[PDB]
């Protein structure tokens, strides 16, 4: 939209009512008269606007009040609360702004943040922005976490995130103006080439795609309308429901052939009975004629009984010649039904072998979206985050998404090559125990008021623990960790000397031999200046291609490439990098997915902070000391960068409110 009202939309906020957030901070307003709400909503919206229209400079309260006009700029404290609320919860003055007011050195409270990922860096920025003392512990020798970027010479290529999913309400929208980011549009034209290397004709392409989408819709019907959500005391997965749906369409085809061929036998046997009347009638007319003709043989003069006999035999022959004449009508009237039905046979099969493979590539696309085999996705809940979609078209980062982490890292206490091994949290504060990854003998102790954990979900999932919590995380937190899914998705990046592909095509598919390998290198991306093609490895193929050497993997890529463009047009790559995310021990996977038997309420469980028991028993119930951010912690935007970033902003606000106090809630 447009106005102060698209400033609310660009902040994921409804511009005509108050959120559950704000009812919490402004319970006076929401329980009060509706006129004041309209005021508040306007101050909320206009302030958001002011920040968004120039997000390279801090939006100070004083400045905010100036642009405000009457009657709205008449309650200076209502404005002051709004502004502080927005600044706390990261809706304004988040990211990389120049600060008018050089922040004071009065540092109150100490926070250790585990992980220098985008969730981590975003909180760090915000906490330091709030005058806390913040230290980041990072196991790797670089920032970004799962925003990895390869750089050798002119060659730049993300091995991690690479798509900004469209800017309508995206916090990266703000970040993209704060950082020189080259956003590139993704052209939807994507042609699939099959195993041999011949482009799939458009007719097929549109035909299959439409079936895919009808097949998805079918599972949805099958989920909501028929409550097929549990089978043999086990939650049903999307992949199961798809098979049941495809079986039932292959079942329909057969049901449909059977009733058609039975329509033919219904009338063949109707004919059969007709021709028996007609064989018998014709043979019964044989003797009639013979009789009559013998009766004309008796020459006149004739007595009357002999005249009657010629005349009667003559009638019964016409009488019997009617019947046979009209039965050849009926025979003719059923002789073309059999020609009609024969030439109107219904569908031979539901999907042909060639067709089914193409369908498998549309399933590889879906397995790549959710970084996991469709047998693992909850049928019920897997599509719960297409409700909060961003408007606009998906984009890619042409300069390496890493430029964003790196930009965030300016100004921040980041200890690299520091692997946390134990987190101790007590009623009186916390100890984080880390080692050096270079030499694991050097041991470090970090003491703090609060720990912000942004450890990847797959790290949190390791048994036996890569990180021990003292005391152990409670049953409700560990069970959410088991229930949730951490999937896997890998990339092969291919560096050449000349664009030998269609440079007006961002991406093109390869259709695979089998089902079992629909994800093995099934999609290629061309997004960078240099000759670089990115190949995805999705689904069950991802977890398997990690046990296979680089050159073999590049080997199969080359083969595929050769088939689609001819063996002489594809030279060897100058530089090759293949990732291996499930192997990476600071990831253990690529991103979370809504596993069968999990739900969106688990993502909320992950974000609940932990409160230790009292030191002195019968002492007052303490504060919470262990906080959680990262993409696996945000229900409405999981498995993305924008979701990671929002989760960092969330916890910084939650920590600042619990350690600096919220003076905006009176």
């Amino acid at each position: 939209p447009s106005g102060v009202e698209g400033a609310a939309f660009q902040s994921r906020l409804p511009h005509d009512r108050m959120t559950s957030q704000e009812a919490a901070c402004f319970p006076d307003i929401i329980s009060g008269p509706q006129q004041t709400q309209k005021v508040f909503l306007f101050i909320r919206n206009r302030t958001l606007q002011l920040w968004l229209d120039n997000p390279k400079i801090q939006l100070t309260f004083e400045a905010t009040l100036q642009q405000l006009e009457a009657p709205y700029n008449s309650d200076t404290v209502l404005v002051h609360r709004v502004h502080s609320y927005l600044e706390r919860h990261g809706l304004i003055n988040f990211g990389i702004y120049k600060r008018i007011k050089p922040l004071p050195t009065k540092k109150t409270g100490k926070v250790i943040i585990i992980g220098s990922g985008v969730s981590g860096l975003a909180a760090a920025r915000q906490l330091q922005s709030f005058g806390m003392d913040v230290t980041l512990l990072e196991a790797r020798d670089r920032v970004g976490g799962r925003v990895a970027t390869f750089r050798k010479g002119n060659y730049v290529a993300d091995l991690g995130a690479m798509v900004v999913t469209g800017l309508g309400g995206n916090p990266m929208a703000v970040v993209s103006k704060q950082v020189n980011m080259e956003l590139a549009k993704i052209k939807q034209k994507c042609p699939l080439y099959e195993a041999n290397g011949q482009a799939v004709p458009k007719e097929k392409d549109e035909m299959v795609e439409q079936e895919f989408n009808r097949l998805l819709e079918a599972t949805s019907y099958l989920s909501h309308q028929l409550d097929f959500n549990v089978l043999n005391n086990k939650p049903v997965s999307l992949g199961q429901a798809l098979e049941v749906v495809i079986q039932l369409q292959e079942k329909h085809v057969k049901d449909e052939q059977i009733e058609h061929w039975k329509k033919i036998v219904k009338t063949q046997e109707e004919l059969k009975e007709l021709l028996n009347k007609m064989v018998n009638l014709k043979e019964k007319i044989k003797e009639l004629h013979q009789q009559y003709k013998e009766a004309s043989e008796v020459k006149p003069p004739r007595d009357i009984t002999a005249e009657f006999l010629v005349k009667s035999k003559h009638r019964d022959l016409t009488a019997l010649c009617k019947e046979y004449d009209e039965l050849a009508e009926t025979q003719g009237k059923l002789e073309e039904k059999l020609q009609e039905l024969e030439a109107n046979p219904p569908s031979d099969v539901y999907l042909s072998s060639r067709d089914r493979q193409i369908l498998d590539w549309h399933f590889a696309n879906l397995e790549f979206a959710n970084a996991t085999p469709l047998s693992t996705l909850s049928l019920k809940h897997w599509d719960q985050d297409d409700d909060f979609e961003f408007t606009g078209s998906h984009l890619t980062v042409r300069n390496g998404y890493s430029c964003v982490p790196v930009a965030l890292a300016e100004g921040l206490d980041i200890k690299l090559n520091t692997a946390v091994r134990q987190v101790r949290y007590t009623a009186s504060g916390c100890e984080v125990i880390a080692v050096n990854t270079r030499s694991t003998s050097q041991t470090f102790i970090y003491k703090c008021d609060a720990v912000l954990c942004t450890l990847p979900l797959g790290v949190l999932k390791q048994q036996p623990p890569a990180v021990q919590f003292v005391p152990p995380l409670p049953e409700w937190k560990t069970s959410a960790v088991q229930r949730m899914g951490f999937g896997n998705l890998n990339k092969v990046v291919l560096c050449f000397d000349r664009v030998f592909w269609d440079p007006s095509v961002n991406l093109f598919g390869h259709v695979g031999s089998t089902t079992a390998s629909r994800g093995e290198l099934f999609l290629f991306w061309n997004l960078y200046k240099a000759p670089i093609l990115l190949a995805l490895v999705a689904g069950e193929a991802a977890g398997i291609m990690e046990n296979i050497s680089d050159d073999v993997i590049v080997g199969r890529c080359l083969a595929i490439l050769k088939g689609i463009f001819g063996s002489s047009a594809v030279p060897q790559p100058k530089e090759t990098v293949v990732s291996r995310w499930r192997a990476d021990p600071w990831a253990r996977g690529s991103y979370s997915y809504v596993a069968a038997g999990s739900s969106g309420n688990d993502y909320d469980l992950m974000a609940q902070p932990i409160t230790p028991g009292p030191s002195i028993p019968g002492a007052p119930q303490p504060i919470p000391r262990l906080f959680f951010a990262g993409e696996h912690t945000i229900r409405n935007y999981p498995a993305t960068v924008h979701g990671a970033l929002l989760s960092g902003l969330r916890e910084a606000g939650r920590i600042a409110d619990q350690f600096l106090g919220a003076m905006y809630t009176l």
Binding site: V163, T165, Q188, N365, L366, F368, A369, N370, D386, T640
Partner: peptide, 4 residues
């Protein structure tokens, strides 16, 4: 999530 589904991309394009």
């Amino acid at each position: 999530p589904r991309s394009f």
